[PDB]
């Protein structure tokens, strides 16, 4: 019928559209499920320009590789919204949507309508929230213990790199959120940490710095790199020549006025710089071991570097926009644009400032702050792809530890929630059915589709999933024979059950929320889709 409207159109309806949706989901599942867990494989995104990059997150794999199929675009957009708000759990979303469409399509072939199947997923979804809010546990984060944050960070960073690099990098994640905390307002910013890309000794030789680190060096050699006590000063207006906005030109009457009109531009430079020199000696004159550094966002005149070089003034330029907020948090200063009003109160303080010449560039290091409300992480590496790999590891690990402070509740990992949720969604007696023999088909499909996560971890480790889960369902049952909350997990070293809690594996509360909510919505709408169409004007 569609060909009569547009001969150049196409349409798959009610059997070919369903196979496309399920095969595209299973095809996306079979490729991308291998990255799940610590034993997952590394992918090399080699584009046409030859750029090499190692990663295991499903967000960046699907972002660089354009998706041709229309179904997998909807799943990639779900991983984008998952990675956007949360930053973790993209591999669980594509596996749940692939398994839900697989388990649902098993029943659609048996002659069941898609409507009551999706109705069972929503009742099963709401039943999981009534199971999740009872399954979570509350802890007191006021103590600020380091042992809990390390093992929680180790659980997230083991799924990115091997063990020896995780042990070196897992203190860097815990050191990121030391001072950034507010009990009353409950405000916690993630963007204040600064990720610098540079080539140095090795990835395993990185370290945490308390204060700020800028990528700009001193232009003149005469200024001192070592400064024992520095008072920062924030500038935003550009010190160079700014053409008068209103078009203008110097028409000199004689040759004697040429150098005088050249000195007219020198007066406006000396006018705004004289207050800077007066600001230096206002604190104390002839004070050794006390420097004065200036951080400007816009450019600096090279003619003016001689003025800063004579008085031993460190000047940096072309700074970032978000760094202006980070200066006052680290150094404790105050941001200023003009130079009309100046005082020693607005100035910050720093205990140590130094520079290091690495290659054809120089990096400025500002450390030894009194009460800094921010910090930075140097991403050192032996190549170009390790920087992006460690950058994705930190950007995915910062969200896992930051959610512990946003909400004190935390779920045990190692597939404990998926295994425990399977039994609870078996038999809904008279709680929430809605109809006889209709909703229960979807309850069974949703319960069986959640257990693919612990099986996928076992497939990557190289053991049998049914054998290691037999003792596990069993362990949980024996636990039940005692009326006790013994949470069981999946250990990939020996192929046996373990306690998620005791051993050291956790998951964030918001990961499982948006993953189950996003997967159930996409799995529902794709089952409701009965026909694919295309139309347009080339």
């Amino acid at each position: 019928s569609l060909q009569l409207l547009n001969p150049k159109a196409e349409s798959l309806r009610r059997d070919a559209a369903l196979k496309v949706n399920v095969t595209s989901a299973e095809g996306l599942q079979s490729v991308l499920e291998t990255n799940l867990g610590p034993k997952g494989t590394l992918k090399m995104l080699v584009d046409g320009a030859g750029n090499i990059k190692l990663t295991k997150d499903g967000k960046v794999l699907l972002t660089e590789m354009q998706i041709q199929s229309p179904t997998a675009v909807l799943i990639a957009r779900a991983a984008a919204a998952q990675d956007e708000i949360t930053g973790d759990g993209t591999t669980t979303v594509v596996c749940l949507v692939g398994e839900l469409l697989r388990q649902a399509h098993r029943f659609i072939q048996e002659g069941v309508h898609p409507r009551i199947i999706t109705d069972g997923f929503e009742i099963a979804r709401k039943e999981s929230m009534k199971f999740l809010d009872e399954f979570k546990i509350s802890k007191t984060n006021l103590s600020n213990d380091r042992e809990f944050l390390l093992q929680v960070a180790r659980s997230s960073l083991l799924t990115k790199v091997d063990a020896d690099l995780t042990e070196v990098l897992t203190p860097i994640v815990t050191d990121a959120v030391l001072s950034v905390y507010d009990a009353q307002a409950d405000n916690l910013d993630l963007h204040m940490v600064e990720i610098m890309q540079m080539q140095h000794l090795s990835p395993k030789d990185t370290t945490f710095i308390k204060g700020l680190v800028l990528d700009h060096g001193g232009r003149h050699p005469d200024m001192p790199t070592r400064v024992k006590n520095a008072y920062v000063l924030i500038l935003n207006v550009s010190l160079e020549y700014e053409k008068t906005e209103v078009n203008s030109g110097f028409f000199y009457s004689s040759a004697d006025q040429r150098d005088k009109l050249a000195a007219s531009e020198r007066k406006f430079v000396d006018a705004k710089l004289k207050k800077i020199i007066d600001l230096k000696n206002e604190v104390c004159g002839m004070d050794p071991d006390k420097g004065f550094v200036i951080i400007n966002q816009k450019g600096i005149d090279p003619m003016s570097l001689d003025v800063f070089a004579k008085h031993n003034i460190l000047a940096l330029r072309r700074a970032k926009r978000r760094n202006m907020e980070r200066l006052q948090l680290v150094t404790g200063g105050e941001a200023q644009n003009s130079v009309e009003d100046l005082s020693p109160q607005i100035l910050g303080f720093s205990g140590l400032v130094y520079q290091e010449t690495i290659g054809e560039e120089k990096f400025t290091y500002v450390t030894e702050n009194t009460d800094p409300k921010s910090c930075t992480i140097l991403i050192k590496g032996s190549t170009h792809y390790a920087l992006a790999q460690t950058k994705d590891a930190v950007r995915d690990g910062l969200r896992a530890v930051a959610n512990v402070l946003k909400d004190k509740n935390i779920i045990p990992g190692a597939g404990a929630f998926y295994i425990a949720l399977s039994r609870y969604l078996r038999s809904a007696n008279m709680n929430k059915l809605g109809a006889k023999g209709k909703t229960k088909t979807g309850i069974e499909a949703f319960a069986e589709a959640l257990l693919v996560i612990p099986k996928t971890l076992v497939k990557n480790s190289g053991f049998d999933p049914l054998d290691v889960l037999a003792m596990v369902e069993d362990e949980l049952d024996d636990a039940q024979d005692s009326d006790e909350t013994r949470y069981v997990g999946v250990d990939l070293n020996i192929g046996d059950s373990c306690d998620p809690t005791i051993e050291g594996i956790w998951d964030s509360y918001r990961v499982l929320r948006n993953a189950i909510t996003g997967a159930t919505g996409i799995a529902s709408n794709l089952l409701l889709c009965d026909e694919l169409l295309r139309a347009g004007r080339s």
Binding site: T41, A163, L201, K204, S253, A255
Partner: protein, 541 residues
């Protein structure tokens, strides 16, 4: 049964994407394919190594036995090779030599691990094996040190340092090039009774000025620098003043002009008559002050006007452009002055001293020589290379850059101690790691043994380039280590090498501790990445 169903995941990722996962055979495809380029760096290894001519797409030909330099220009489509490419570049921008050792050791760990993967050992265990073997290698290298140096000032002490590095690249020239580099370092370092607290050193201190023609023996050392530039205005006196104050200007010497654009405005003809003399008297007020203090040389980075050049010719002041900004500051380090952008006039404190400046032709082209005697210098030197071809002089420059980079590798850390070279410490590490594997029972013992076998290429590669049998001198060398004297056993390269034993101290071949540690770490990290990947995803073009 004619056309296949065409892999019904073809609705997924486009045809340009290629997957080469494992189980299918990715490891077997990779470790092998890279054996071609492994033989490239293997043949170019040692003092008798063969340089390789690489013609890039632009046509700039380069001929080198330096492996790194090679892989920068090679457009390599294989992604697994590129992990080894920029991993070697990290050694270049940092340590500066060994570019070839890190590539050979990184490739051999993949070649020798064929037995582990083929037998069926887990890939995750192999990464844990080499990591623990890497830690034992770093701890064990400190005990085999016998070259603890603390002077690092005199020229004869550098014969154990620079000459092994220069002996690798173009082995025939040892004493001549070592004299140029060692004499350059002595001019760079200051004269003092005790210079400590980590004195500063950089690779930009020693520069290389390439001159066409002349034998390599006729080269000499210059404390200043030499530019291919035409002087203007006059001939120098060369002994009369005995010393010359040199002002370096960033801005030019011209009637000063404004940033925003202006023009000449004249309301009447009275200003027209005085405008011709006003420009002359304006510069004369600023130029006469410069000549009062006796500044016999001016350097202006931008273009100098003819009006400013005319006033300087009669007083006999030397002029020079120096358009590039990087080489402008190096001249300031020689005289010991600071940049003075504005024309102005100057001061005794900011102006430096230069003994003499003389102009001649070294290879037919007129050049300006800033050589000075009895003057004070600080971090500046040059080596005038004379050679028959530009292609050969390019390799001498990188050999000197690797030589002075080793000086940066010594003086920047607290200790750059030596080690026995010529296939001496590598065979010792095979005995150490062989004994270490038996101490820890477990399934990872196979990885520890195969990690030691990868170090075998270092002695035999010197024997293969020497035209010797590997199955004779290599097992005979193990009998020499049975038992100080056993530590200084190495590989001989001579017609009398049938015995296969030559003492190291007769010729003083040594290697750096920090260079081999950084090479072993980057080599292990390079092999760690290639063995950790399983899937490789390509794209169109």
């Amino acid at each position: 049964s004619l056309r296949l169903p065409q892999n019904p995941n073809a609705g997924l990722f486009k045809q340009g994407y290629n997957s080469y996962s494992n189980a299918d055979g990715q490891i077997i495809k990779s470790i092998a394919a890279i054996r071609e380029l492994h033989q490239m760096c293997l043949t170019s290894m040692g003092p008798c190594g063969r340089n390789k001519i690489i013609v890039n797409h632009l046509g700039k030909i380069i001929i080198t036995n330096d492996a790194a330099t090679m892989l920068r220009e090679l457009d390599i489509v294989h992604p697994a090779v590129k992990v080894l490419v920029m991993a070697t570049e990290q050694q270049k921008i940092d340590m500066g030599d060994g570019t070839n050792l890190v590539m050979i050791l990184a490739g051999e760990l993949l070649n020798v691990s064929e037995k582990l993967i083929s037998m069926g050992l887990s890939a995750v265990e192999i990464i844990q094996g080499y990591n623990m073997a890497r830690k034992f290698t770093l701890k064990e290298l400190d005990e085999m040190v016998v070259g603890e140096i603390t002077d690092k000032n005199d020229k004869n002490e550098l014969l154990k340092m620079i000459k092994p590095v220069i002996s690798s690249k173009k082995y025939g020239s040892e004493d001549i090039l070592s004299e140029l580099v060692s004499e350059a370092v002595s001019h760079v370092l200051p004269v003092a009774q005790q210079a400590g607290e980590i004195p500063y050193f950089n690779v930009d201190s020693i520069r290389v000025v390439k001159i066409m023609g002349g034998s390599l023996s006729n080269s000499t050392v210059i404390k200043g620098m030499v530019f291919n530039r035409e002087p203007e205005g006059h001939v120098k006196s060369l002994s009369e003043d005995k010393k010359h104050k040199v002002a370096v200007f960033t801005c030019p010497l011209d009637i000063a002009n404004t940033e925003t654009k202006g023009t000449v405005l004249l309301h009447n003809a009275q200003e027209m008559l005085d405008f011709s003399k006003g420009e002359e008297k304006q510069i004369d007020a600023m130029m006469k002050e410069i000549a009062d203090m006796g500044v016999e040389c001016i350097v202006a980075g931008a273009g100098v006007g003819e009006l400013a050049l005319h006033y300087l010719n009669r007083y006999g002041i030397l002029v020079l452009k120096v358009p590039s900004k990087f080489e402008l500051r190096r001249l300031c380090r020689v005289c010991g002055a600071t940049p003075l952008p504005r024309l102005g006039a100057p001061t005794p404190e900011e102006l430096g001293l230069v003994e003499t400046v003389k102009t001649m032709e070294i290879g037919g082209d007129r050049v300006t020589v800033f050589k000075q005697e009895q003057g004070e210098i600080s971090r500046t030197s040059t080596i005038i290379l004379r050679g028959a071809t530009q292609n050969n002089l390019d390799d001498i420059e990188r050999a000197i850059d690797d030589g002075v980079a080793a000086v940066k590798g010594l003086m920047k850390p607290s200790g750059g101690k030596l080690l026995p070279g010529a296939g001496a410490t590598e065979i010792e590490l095979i005995s150490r790691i062989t004994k270490y594997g038996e101490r820890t029972p477990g399934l990872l013992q196979l990885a520890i043994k195969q990690f030691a076998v990868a170090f075998e290429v270092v002695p035999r590669t010197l024997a293969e380039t020497a035209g010797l049998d590997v199955n004779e001198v290599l097992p005979n060398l193990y009998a020499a280590h049975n038992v100080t004297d056993h530590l200084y056993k190495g590989v001989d390269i001579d017609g009398e090498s049938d015995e296969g034993v030559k003492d190291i101290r007769e010729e003083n071949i040594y290697d750096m501790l920090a260079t081999k540690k950084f090479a072993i770490n980057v080599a292990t990290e390079a092999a760690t990445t290639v063995l950790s990947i399983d899937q490789i995803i390509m794209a169109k073009k």
